[PDB]
Amino acid sequence: QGCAFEGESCNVQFYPCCPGLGLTCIPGNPDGTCYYL
After folding, report:
1. Who's near 32: CB < 8 A, 6+ residues apart?
2. 35 bridge partner residues
3. Which of 2, 8, 16, 29 has the most other CB atoms within 10 Å of its CB?
């Protein structure tokens, strides 16, 4: 797996979130959480 799904943590340094569906990393500096917008 490359990108993270909703509910887990995502690192904007090596492991980003899965785009296309509408997910974002919060805070994402450097670690974040994948949530739906």
Report:
1. 9, 10, 11, 12, 17, 24, 25, 26
2. 24
3. 16
Establish how many alpha carbons lie within 13 A of residue 22's alpha carbon, considering only the half-sphere containing its beta carbon. Answer: 2
Say which experimental method was used.
NMR
Nearest to 9 by CA among 35, 33, 36, 25: 33
Residue type, 32: G
Terminal C-alpha separation, the chain: 22
Give the number of C-alpha atoms closer than 13 A to the C-alpha of residue 15, restricted to the C-beta side: 11
